[PDB]
Design a protein around this ligand. Structure first.
Ligand code: NH4
Lengths: 163, 93, 86
């Protein structure tokens, strides 16, 4: 590539059939949930509404791409609707925009907005300081795997941490 | 060196029946071959590629082997261009 | 030796006309004491001649074809450099 799709194909991963992530809830495609009912009964029903057709899934490789892209769109809309996130996002170039979306896929719009200091540092074109800042957070501890690459992307403003 | 007419620089599998006919006219003059009748190869390029060297010889006793080896040379150079464009497309993406 | 080389033909076969190819066969037959070669065994120029395989030479000339192919290769070895055929 490198592009926005490759980013979460590495981080959150593409799996095909329904799997459980590093927590317990059901996830299909790339980080799509699913899944309000505590069983594989309603995680099987909301997918009929989402895809357009039927059963189980097991969904095709391309339907998951569409699913992923619809969720990236949902992430972007959520970001721009957010009063704490939009001003940060609008000042960012597309490489760094992908990194903020990456964060939203994981901890959600509301979770990201809590990084007040690091967001302001990203807004004011102050990359390394936000990179040192984000590193000293609770999210960094759980999975240093995903976090290192998102930080590297924020600092350099390039896709290097994936090439 | 072999320089095809610019309109024939496509992979022979995409050659129309007319393209095939223009190939023969060009080859005749380029290689000083005995006149090749227009209807010796009434087929498109993807048909032409299924023919054996024996088939070329039956159709053109004077020039069949030349036409066949010419086609092999054309196929080879296109195959190289295909893997030069392939390695570069993967290099960018 | 070696030389083994035509005296009145260009040493670069890629420039040979249909007539030059016929004279090369005529010279070859005499120089190498070959069986008589029909002039219309290679109705083609030097460019076309360089596309043929050893197998094609043999098909056109059962008695002398391999000889003529190696003779053609010998002419290309000395002199340098190309072509050929791209
Ligand atoms: N040859």
């Amino acid at each position: 590539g490198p592009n926005i799709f490759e980013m979460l194909r590495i981080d959150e991963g593409l799996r095909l059939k329904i799997y459980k992530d590093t927590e317990g809830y059901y996830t299909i495609g790339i980080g799509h949930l699913l899944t309000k009912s505590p069983s594989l009964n309603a995680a099987k029903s909301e997918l009929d509404k989402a895809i357009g057709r039927n059963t189980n899934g097991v969904i095709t490789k391309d339907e998951a791409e569409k699913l992923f892209c619809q969720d990236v769109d949902a992430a972007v809309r959520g970001i721009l609707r957010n009063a704490k996130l939009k001003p940060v996002y609008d000042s960012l170039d597309c490489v760094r925009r992908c990194a903020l979306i990456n964060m939203v896929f994981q901890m959600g719009e509301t979770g990201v907005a809590g990084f007040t200091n690091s967001l302001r540092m990203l807004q004011q074109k102050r990359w390394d300081e936000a990179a040192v800042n984000l590193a000293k957070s609770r999210w960094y501890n759980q999975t240093p795997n995903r976090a290192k690459r998102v930080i590297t992307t924020f600092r350099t403003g390039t896709w290097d941490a994936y090439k | 060196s072999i320089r095809l007419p610019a309109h024939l620089r496509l992979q022979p599998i995409y050659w129309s029946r007319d393209d095939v006919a223009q190939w023969l006219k060009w080859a005749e003059n380029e290689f000083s071959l005995s006149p090749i009748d227009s209807n010796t190869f009434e087929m498109n390029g993807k048909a032409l590629l299924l023919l054996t060297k024996e088939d070329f010889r039956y159709r053109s006793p004077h020039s069949g082997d030349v036409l066949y080896e010419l086609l092999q040379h054309i196929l080879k150079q296109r195959d190289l261009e295909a893997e030069a464009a392939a390695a570069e497309a993967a290099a960018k993406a």
